[PDB]
């Protein structure tokens, strides 16, 4: 089929965009995880309070690992490059582009376009133009074209899939595995998580690991040790939900 | 300028502007540094000037042989209402008029052409697949580095370019635009298919089969070997839109092309049909009986 070409493609893209796992040593002085994981929150609230196609804050991660895999910055400028991130990958997914103007109103007018624009070219050339790059999403669909479940049930592990993969995007796990098994794990963690609540009705779960790195051709350890971060990531939301108090 | 590419030679001027070629340093490679101008919005970059080269990139990964690859892409200068963006690019030896010209065959041969063509229709079908359609398909944007490749070029590029007419130039040399690509503009992707056929027989084995001016010129030109179609095969609508004013008729294929073969010619046909629907496939060309 044209299921198998595409696929080989995507794959072979998916590495030409893949960040550096190293790159919190290598390549940033300033830049700690810790302070990745409050720009990708910021902007995984700016898509969800500007409604944007899901896929924009997973594409805006991955332009902004790319990035820091290729330049150092500084602290003070990383929100900035969030918010480029964001510019770039709504002009890639979305009918209607976010607003530069927009983008920094929720800076609370920290930044400015004239800094965004700047960034752009930044972005966009360290990137060697290189954007209409893969996200879990796109694969998400493919699995879920390959899978026995009615257009009911599809919906609902589509649902809890892509909350996954945002679970993931804000953590470091995202820099270290592709989308594909980002949106492996999340399937997989989706699946078998609606097994259990209703039985006897998304069996499809029934061996989905081995099935999915089958597609994938990886390691279906990794699929498994994927699911396991995910699973746990989602646990970490309970501190989160709370703690919001003191 | 600036790129961390060394120019040398300059392989081109026209309609992409001048195309000149360079070698990759730290590879020690060579490429072929062409360029253009973009408007400097408020919103940054053209939005659809980086979805149209994010595309073009979103290709090397395909690795098809019979189409160039978009190596790397770089905006240059930004100035208040203008960004100039450096495309680097693939870099082929020579063209397919380089390629007919230093021509040692005296008409020949047929499976340097069957071959040639089967593989032409190749990057094609792909660019097509991928959603792509050519404007200024011809034999400077046909090209073979050596040993034989026919790696397809300026792809897509009409969208990038289309503020080129702020230059409202330049060669426009349209020996080769569908009967619609200016009796209307329908851009189209089977317009990108008539192209074909005149390539096709400007092989046998001489220059342009259509070479003109006047679109309407050229448009009569064309119905002089096809035949003008009676209605309804007839549209609209704009840009002196000529109805039908001199009347023809059916005229032989091989006869002012020596010479398609029992099939050449029949094929040919079926490329170049008026009727854009009942036209022929990308595909469907490539696999009949003519090979």
């Not at chain 1, 996200?135 to 899978?147: R, V, W």
């Not at chain 2, 072929?32 to 979805?51: D, F, H, M, Q, Y």
Request: proline fraction near 7%; hydrophobic fraction near 40%; include cysteine.
């Amino acid at each position: 089929l044209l299921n198998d070409r595409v696929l080989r493609a995507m794959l072979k893209a998916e590495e030409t965009c893949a960040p550096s796992v190293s790159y919190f040593k290598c390549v940033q002085k300033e830049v700690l995880p810790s302070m990745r994981k409050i720009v990708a929150t910021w902007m995984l609230e700016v898509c969800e309070e500007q409604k944007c196609e899901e896929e924009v804050f997973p594409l805006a991660m991955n332009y902004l690992d790319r990035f820091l895999s290729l330049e150092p910055v500084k602290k003070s400028r990383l929100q900035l490059l969030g918010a480029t991130c964001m510019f770039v990958a709504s002009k890639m997914k979305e009918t209607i582009p976010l607003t530069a103007e927009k983008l920094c109103i929720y800076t609370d007018n920290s930044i400015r376009p004239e800094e965004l624009l700047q960034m752009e070219l930044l972005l966009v050339n360290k990137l060697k133009w290189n954007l209409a790059a893969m996200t879990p999403h796109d694969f998400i669909e493919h699995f879920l074209s390959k899978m026995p479940e009615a257009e009911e049930n599809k919906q609902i592990i589509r649902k809890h899939a892509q909350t996954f993969v945002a679970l993931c995007a804000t953590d470091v796990k995202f820099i270290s595995n592709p989308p594909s098994m980002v949106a492996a794990g999340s399937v997989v963690a989706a699946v078998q998580g609606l097994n259990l609540r209703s039985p006897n009705n998304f069996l499809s779960y029934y061996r989905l690991t081995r099935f999915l790195s089958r597609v994938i051709k990886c390691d279906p350890d990794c699929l498994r040790a994927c699911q396991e971060q995910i699973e746990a990531l989602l646990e970490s939301s309970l501190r989160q939900a709370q703690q919001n108090m003191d | 300028a600036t790129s961390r590419y060394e120019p040398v030679a300059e392989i081109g001027v026209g309609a992409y502007g001048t195309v000149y070629k360079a070698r990759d340093p730290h590879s020690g490679h060579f490429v072929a540094l062409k360029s253009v101008r973009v408007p400097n919005g408020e919103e940054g970059l053209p939005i659809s000037t980086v979805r149209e080269v994010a595309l073009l990139r979103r290709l090397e990964a395909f690795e098809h042989p019979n189409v160039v690859r978009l190596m790397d892409v770089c905006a240059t200068s930004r100035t208040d209402r203008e960004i100039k963006v450096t495309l680097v690019f693939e870099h082929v030896d020579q063209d397919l008029r380089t390629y007919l010209d230093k021509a040692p065959p005296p008409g020949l041969p047929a499976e340097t052409i069957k071959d040639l063509m089967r593989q032409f229709l190749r990057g094609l079908d792909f660019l097509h697949a991928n959603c792509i359609v050519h404007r200024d398909l011809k034999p400077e944007n046909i090209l073979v580095t050596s040993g034989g490749t026919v790696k397809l070029a300026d792809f897509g590029l009409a969208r990038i370019y289309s503020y080129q007419m702020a230059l409202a130039p330049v060669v426009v040399t349209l020996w080769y635009r569908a009967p619609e690509v200016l009796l209307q503009s329908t851009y189209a992707t089977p317009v990108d298919m008539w192209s074909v056929g005149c390539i096709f027989a400007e092989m046998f084995r001489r220059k342009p089969l259509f070479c003109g001016n006047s679109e309407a010129d050229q448009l009569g030109k064309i119905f002089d070997l096809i035949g003008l179609p009676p209605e309804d095969d007839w549209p609209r609508d704009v840009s002196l839109p000529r109805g039908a004013f001199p009347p023809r008729g059916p005229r032989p294929v091989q006869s002012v092309v020596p010479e398609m073969e029992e099939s050449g010619a029949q094929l040919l046909l079926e490329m170049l049909t008026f009727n854009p629907h009942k036209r022929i496939s990308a595909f469907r060309a490539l696999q009949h009986s003519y090979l």
